[PDB]
Subunit: 283 residues, 4 copies
């Protein structure tokens, strides 16, 4: 009968060998994708920097660090920044950049550390709080609704919020999923933070469980240096109404709150329809 004689546990590593699935086909192309950071839109640079300085922010927490491109931007512009993520595969790249730039003193004092949203309160010693916590580039939408009620969303958000000082900023965004769901397609290469130097082809799959949007799964088909490869990633489709509710509730109502358009303000029922929705609040 049927059990699977594994050669090594899932999740272990040996010294000679490449990890688990690290050099398959799909991982290969996915690196190309996470690496098509690196020509940051001036639009974005100007806004984020504008905002942080207009609110007198200095101590920053980037909670969906990734390869750290946004943190690097802050770390260069003289902010003092702590960056965390739960992905080793991505923090790899932020740590590698810091080390490369280790002689620059601003980068010597860049702190990169491990952290999970569901335990952020005991993973990051908040202290009294950060002047600004950021979570951009649609990363919150990675966190799936595994237990049905959006209970893990609600806990991720309260915690992220718990990192903010009184009179501080949380800047957290998400892609326009109101658009995506009503269209059924998630358009390629409209990233507003980083212009994609990478021509890449997208198939949108929406899963709807009992009349409730539950997952948007994207299969990216990227073309490879001179040599077509595929990889897949999934998102929770946060609608604007819901998320507003969710994030506001995370502060227990005692917040301010504005919803940004694509970087400029958002009036409900606008002529222009944004690609991303940015939420900025103050505790």
């Amino acid at each position: 009968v049927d059990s699977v004689y594994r050669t090594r546990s899932l999740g272990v590593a040996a010294e000679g060998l490449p990890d688990q699935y690290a050099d398959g086909e799909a991982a290969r192309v996915w690196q190309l994708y996470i690496g098509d950071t690196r020509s940051r839109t001036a639009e974005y640079k100007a806004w984020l920097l504008g905002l942080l300085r207009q609110h007198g922010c200095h101590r920053v927490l980037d909670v969906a660090c990734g390869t750290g491109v946004d943190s690097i931007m802050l770390v260069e512009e003289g902010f003092s920044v702590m960056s965390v993520d739960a992905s080793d595969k991505m923090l790899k790249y932020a740590l590698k950049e810091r080390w490369n730039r280790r002689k620059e003193p601003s980068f010597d004092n860049w702190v990169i550390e491990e952290a999970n949203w569901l335990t952020l309160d005991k993973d990051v010693l908040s202290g009294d709080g950060f002047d600004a916590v950021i979570c951009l580039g649609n990363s919150f939408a990675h966190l799936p609704d595994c237990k049905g009620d959006q209970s893990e969303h609600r806990l991720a958000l309260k915690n992220i919020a718990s990192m903010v000082r009184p009179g501080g900023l949380l800047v957290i965004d998400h892609r326009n999923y109101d658009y995506i769901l009503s269209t059924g397609c998630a358009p390629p290469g409209k990233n507003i933070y980083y212009k994609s130097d990478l021509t890449k082809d997208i198939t949108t799959s929406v899963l709807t469980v009992n009349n409730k949007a539950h997952m948007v799964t994207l299969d990216y088909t990227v073309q490879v240096p001179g040599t077509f490869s595929k990889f897949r990633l999934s998102y929770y489709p946060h609608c604007l109404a819901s998320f507003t509710e969710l994030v506001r509730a995370a502060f227990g109502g005692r917040c301010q709150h504005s919803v940004l358009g694509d970087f400029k303000p958002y009036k409900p029922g606008q002529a222009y329809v944004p690609c991303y929705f940015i939420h900025v609040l103050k505790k």
Copy 2:
């Protein structure tokens, strides 16, 4: 037909989430395991440092870096060391230790970098060669015989050898698989380099295909200091002493000097004492 909808590709990551299998039962115990390096045997310390200095070695390449515990011993002792591995999960720990000790200058000059045995000639800029190249703690036995001829072994060894400067040293070891196969057991806590402080419990499975030993798979059952019993599994290619001697010698094209060590003590075939590891040390012939 049954077309299984994955949530994300194998091998990708997202920002919020922990990687692939990173915090399953077995991975959590396996970290404890790769981490019980916490007290290096004085025996070993004395030998390796003895060898390297008696042969006037300085520029060192550690090609199965791991968490870097051997490289750290060399860095500290004033050698200049480049350490590579192909495992990110393990390099993590070498790089973390380096960063922690970043203000010590010797460590500022420790080089940690990615490299795969099958592509080591391209992956590492050997230049003129390294004074000594080391591959210890039975790491070469990780590389499986995927194709059937031992062709990949033969390439991995030829590459490692290519890292050594003329008149230089290759120190490469492997567990006594001649004993393991004839016993059928690979005894726990015999590590000749690092005395372990977990009460690992071990089951040895040998796979024999068409009468040729092909894999030795170990299920370690480790402890949680009413504690916890957790398991994880790791496998090894059972390099017999005769075959390996052959293999490694051939990697230099016969143009070498070759001694095989006992447990750190020289090895006389059919000697009274039976060693746990077999260390092969090699010079090129100038």
Copy 3:
């Protein structure tokens, strides 16, 4: 990766042992489900028999046999019936019933045999053709659109239709997926063929790829609480009419039934199943 060392190949069997997944949680519940295809609605029995005799049919092909419950009804009513299916697990139960009733001569002449829709022309000796070929209980919706073009549907339908003699009948149905997709729910216990009351609980998931409905996947939660899952290609009424008509090459007469009663487009009553009955012109 790494080298997964399976105990036995996927799809083999040994003598001592239960097959593959045969007695896991889900499988056991699913048997309860396929087996509650039972107390057959009088509604149905009257319609189907009505239609077949109405058109003087005798030689019948049941192409999605299953456990054979419709086949048995025909066998009993004196028709001469060949029933095929591609599923061994289900044919098991048609064969078992036949053997149980082997003494009754009408059952001695029931033919149960293996067949795939994609190879039906080569799997069933279609001869001159059958007087009627039935494919009911939404079974065609099992066949997925694995390529992307509906090219396998097109071939399955073209094979099925090739089983019908000239002047003969194809009866093929599908659930009202126009309703399901616009609602997003596929309501439980509305099987108009087999009054299926049994405490069943249903979650409907729709997969929509690049704006085109592509799968409806149902997780049944049944009272033993155990869940199992089954999926369907959501054939809309418009496209299916198209598809099935094209399978005959336009050379057909075609009516779509309401729930057993005729269907006028945009009628007050919305049906649960849509039955297509097709006569191949000579």
Copy 4:
């Protein structure tokens, strides 16, 4: 969050579609295998029929029925036979043959039913017992040692022995795994029940856990497609103990050579080992 969203549950079926893995390459070749071991050796048929009538048996239980080729032999020779198996994929073929032969009366009275060794006492109604219970063609070797103690083997054999009525026969065999493990190869086309009519090709893999033989896995390469099957390597001493114990020592026991008797350390080394046990109350 990292795992599947399968199209349908492992182990279900839908009406249109072929089952789970039923028409992948390996299955396709495996059918050829389970099917093309069928010109039955005259050697065998003479022995089995010899034995059964020698001991005046009539009511038979075939507990590892398979495609029912041994059962059919008995059915034809006028025995009254119940055959059970736990495999639907194999019973299929026994049932199909019975139906094909339905108008021959002895076949009308052939009973084919589902049964598992671990629950044989609750799956078959022994009644007073069967005159003979057979389990041949190395099928018991299919049953793995999943717990580690051979506890499931001990239960399967106990159960099987419970099918035998007092003064009755259990005939149960297993391939010579003492030979196989000392050689490391399990030789192709040695089947002495049925002429191995397919040209096969065989690779033997032995798994030895902590110095105890645990699995013998065969990759068959048939004329080129490949499939794989695994066996628990029952050594002769062990199995003798195991089966004897299943009767509680309350038995008469003979091993057989290849169909001949077997004296330990004789010249000829057999391919199969047949054990025939007689209950004495």
